[PDB]
Amino acid sequence: TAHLRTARLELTPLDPAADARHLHHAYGDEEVMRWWTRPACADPAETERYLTSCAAAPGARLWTIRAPDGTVPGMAGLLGGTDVPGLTWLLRRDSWGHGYATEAAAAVVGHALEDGGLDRVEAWIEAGNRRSLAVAARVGLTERARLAQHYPHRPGPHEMVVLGKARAEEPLTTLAVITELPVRDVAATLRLVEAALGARTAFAIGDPPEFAEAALTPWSAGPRFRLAAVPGPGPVEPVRLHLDAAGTADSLHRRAVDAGARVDGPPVRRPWGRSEFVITLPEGHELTVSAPV
Amino acid sequence: TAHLRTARLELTPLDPAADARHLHHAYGDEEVMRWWTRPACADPAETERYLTSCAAAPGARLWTIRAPDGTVPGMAGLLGGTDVPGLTWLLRRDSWGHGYATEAAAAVVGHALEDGGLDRVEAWIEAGNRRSLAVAARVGLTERARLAQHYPHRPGPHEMVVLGKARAEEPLTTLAVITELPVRDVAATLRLVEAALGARTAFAIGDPPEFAEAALTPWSAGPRFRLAAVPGPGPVEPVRLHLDAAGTADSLHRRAVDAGARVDGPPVRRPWGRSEFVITLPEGHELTVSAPV
Ligand SMILES: CC(C)(COP(=O)(O)OP(=O)(O)OC[C@H]1O[C@@H](n2cnc3c(N)ncnc32)[C@H](O)[C@@H]1OP(=O)(O)O)[C@@H](O)C(=O)NCCC(=O)NCCS
Numbered sequence: 001t002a003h004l005r006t007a008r009l010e011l012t013p014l015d016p017a018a019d020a021r022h023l024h025h026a027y028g029d030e031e032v033m034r035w036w037t038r039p040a041c042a043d044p045a046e047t048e049r050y051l052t053s054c055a056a057a058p059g060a061r062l063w064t065i066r067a068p069d070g071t072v073p074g075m076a077g078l079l080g081g082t083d084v085p086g087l088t089w090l091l092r093r094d095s096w097g098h099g100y101a102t103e104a105a106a107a108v109v110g111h112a113l114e115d116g117g118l119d120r121v122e123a124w125i126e127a128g129n130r131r132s133l134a135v136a137a138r139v140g141l142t143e144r145a146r147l148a149q150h151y152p153h154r155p156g157p158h159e160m161v162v163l164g165k166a167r168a169e170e171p172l173t174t175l176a177v178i179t180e181l182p183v184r185d186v187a188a189t190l191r192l193v194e195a196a197l198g199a200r201t202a203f204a205i206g207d208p209p210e211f212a213e214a215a216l217t218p219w220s221a222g223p224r225f226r227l228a229a230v231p232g233p234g235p236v237e238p239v240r241l242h243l244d245a246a247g248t249a250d251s252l253h254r255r256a257v258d259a260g261a262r263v264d265g266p267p268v269r270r271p272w273g274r275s276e277f278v279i280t281l282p283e284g285h286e287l288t289v290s291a292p293v
Numbered sequence: 294t295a296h297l298r299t300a301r302l303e304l305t306p307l308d309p310a311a312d313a314r315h316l317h318h319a320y321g322d323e324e325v326m327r328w329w330t331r332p333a334c335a336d337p338a339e340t341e342r343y344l345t346s347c348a349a350a351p352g353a354r355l356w357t358i359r360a361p362d363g364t365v366p367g368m369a370g371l372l373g374g375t376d377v378p379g380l381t382w383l384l385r386r387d388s389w390g391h392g393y394a395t396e397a398a399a400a401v402v403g404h405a406l407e408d409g410g411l412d413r414v415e416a417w418i419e420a421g422n423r424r425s426l427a428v429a430a431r432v433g434l435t436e437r438a439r440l441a442q443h444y445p446h447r448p449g450p451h452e453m454v455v456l457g458k459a460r461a462e463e464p465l466t467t468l469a470v471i472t473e474l475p476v477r478d479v480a481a482t483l484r485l486v487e488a489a490l491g492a493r494t495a496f497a498i499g500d501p502p503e504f505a506e507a508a509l510t511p512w513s514a515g516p517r518f519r520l521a522a523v524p525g526p527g528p529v530e531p532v533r534l535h536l537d538a539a540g541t542a543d544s545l546h547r548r549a550v551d552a553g554a555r556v557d558g559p560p561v562r563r564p565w566g567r568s569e570f571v572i573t574l575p576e577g578h579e580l581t582v583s584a585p586v
Contacts, residue, residue: 083495083496083513084511084512084513119511120511120512122512122513124513143436144510144512144513144514144515145512145513145514145515146436146468146514147468147513147514148468162512162513162514164511164512164513166511170491170510170511171539171540171544172491172538172539172540172544172545172548173452173491173509173510173538173539173540174490174491174509174510174515174516174536174537174538174539175438175439175440175441175452175516175537175538175539176438176440176516176536176537177470177472177509177516177517177518177534177535177536177537178534178535178536178537179470179472179518179532179533179534179535180532180533180534180535197467198463198465198466198467199467216466216467216470217437217463217466217467218377218412218413218459218463219377219413219415219437219438219455219457220376220377220415220417220437220438220440220455221437221438221439221440221455222437222438222455223467223468223469223470224470225470225472226535237530239472239473239532240472240473240521241470241471241472241473242470242471242472242473242519243467243468243469243470243471244467244468244469244470244471244514245465245466245467245468246464246465246466246467246468247464247465247466251464251465252465255465289467
């Protein structure tokens with residue numbers, strides 16, 4: 001690995017041993033760890049243990065930010081084991097507002113989209129993380145999507161903004177996938193999902209409705225699916241839909257069971273870190289509802 | 294209708310006859326209209342015709358912005374006849390950069406979510422509309438989705454961000470809908486979609502892959518579907534997906550047919566103003582791809 005040199009910064013490959021004590025001023029800070037995936041580390045020891053772990057991750061490429069006067073404001077770099085290239089940075093309070101994150105982040109992205117021969121980079125910032133959302137924007141990242149997430153050291157889940165930047169954007173891209181479901185009684189299915197999944201009839205044609213759309217959110221666009229009346233008595237071949245939801249599985253589960261829908265049983269925490277339960281329509285279709293917790 | 298008073302502005306219900314002249318400094322500007330739904334009006338006469346029309350919209354409710362120094366920097370307000378409360382605004386060149394739009398936008402927004410007794414407001418901004426997305430961000434509007442659209446007075450379609458603000462946020466909201474497709478050879482399907490639909494594989498469980506996810510975009514969260522391998526013979530009931538895409542159907546079509554996919558035929562203009570064509574997987578699954586044009 002090489003070193004990143006910026007206007008007034010010197011980004012050098014992370015050295016858990018050498019960098020532990022310096023970077024502990026960030027990792028050890030509760031004010032800084034406030035938005036992180038885990039609680040501030042108890043000691044430079046723990047920070048060493050942690051930093052090592054982060055650096056080990058397949059794909060990881062982390063640098064330690066070296067200020068002009070030696071000082072180490074913090075680190076930046078690409079995350080380990082992510083699929084789609086993830087960014088990450090962090091600074092100690094004492095360096096906030098110096099445009100470091102922006103300068104270091106800028107270096108990492110720039111390097112990644114060139115010498116690192118990558119296609120694009122992504123940054124996951126929590127909804128209220130004002131300071132970090134600013135850096136992202138300043139760096140060239142633009143909101144791509146959003147996702148829920150739960151940090152074990154936290155009371156409840158939270159919002160995550162997927163902000164990214166590409167080498168060259170894809171003119172041809174897909175905006176949504178509205179899968180269809182052939183149901184017996186459209187009007188009846190609509191009422192069920194309205195209740196069980198808090199959906200709302202985006203539109204419907206026919207009297208009674210022969211075809212409709214169920215928006216799973218109150219907005220013009222977003223998660224949703226259509227319905228098609230089955231012209232017959234012959235049982236329908238089930239369709240398996242997976243719904244990424246926000247909130248706690250319980251709250252979702254509860255809503256669904258309270259809705260009088262057919263629930264397979266309490267929510268189960270799968271190995272890929274997601275609690276889920278399935279809702280089965282009378283036609284046989286299966287909808288599994290997954291939440292961070 | 295009531296007036297809205299802001300820190301330093303006065304928003305009075307729009308008056309086509311009275312405001313026409315003032316507002317034509319915006320509506321008559323090509324600089325400004327590049328981002329509007331229609332070409333700059335030829336004259337105050339036309340602007341008056343236009344304004345009157347927008348004002349007639351069922352549910353419309355727009356205000357003319359009046360600065361302390363008499364002037365009218367532009368208009369702002371709620372759009373009419375849009376199932377989901379829409380926001381609109383525009384300023385004449387000469388007033389750009391004074392926090393006007395944000396001041397007026399915030400007013401319209403604040404009002405609608407209180408005295409206007411609305412549940413929420415939306416704003417559809419073109420992805421490249423920097424100046425406008427900033428205003429929307431400042432006012433409190435957050436990205437909710439994305440949709441393509443084509444303006445008759447333009448060459449090709451474009452992307453639109455649906456940014457929203459709700460009076461009260463919904464706890465249990467679905468984030469995404471990942472429909473599953475049963476295929477004979479997962480790894481074969483993947484190769485196909487990657488080329489025909491510019492997809493990319495997110496994950497593939499097993500070797501050869503028995504279960505996988507195909508992301509139709511390069512980002513962490515977004516439109517995508519999973520593939521499940523079906524063991525024995527027997528047929529598979531087709532699953533019909535609908536894919537809202539960005540770009541010209543032709544370009545989309547071209548790519549599909551070129552990728553050697555099974556295409557029913559060239560794109561087709563539908564009544565609901567959308568051009569589409571269908572790709573059929575060997576299993577029989579049918580995926581229709583529609584675009585604004
Ligand atoms: C979007 C548009 C209104 C521009 O708004 P703006 O004038 O850029 O945004 P404001 O009106 O909130 O002015 C903000 C700017 O004024 C500055 N400003 C000056 N005095 C200010 C004050 N007292 N308070 C707040 N901001 C002030 C800000 O610093 C900011 O400068 P910055 O651009 O570098 O951020 C204009 O480009 C336009 O009319 N576009 C076409 C119509 C359109 O955008 N439609 C969108 C679809 S709904």
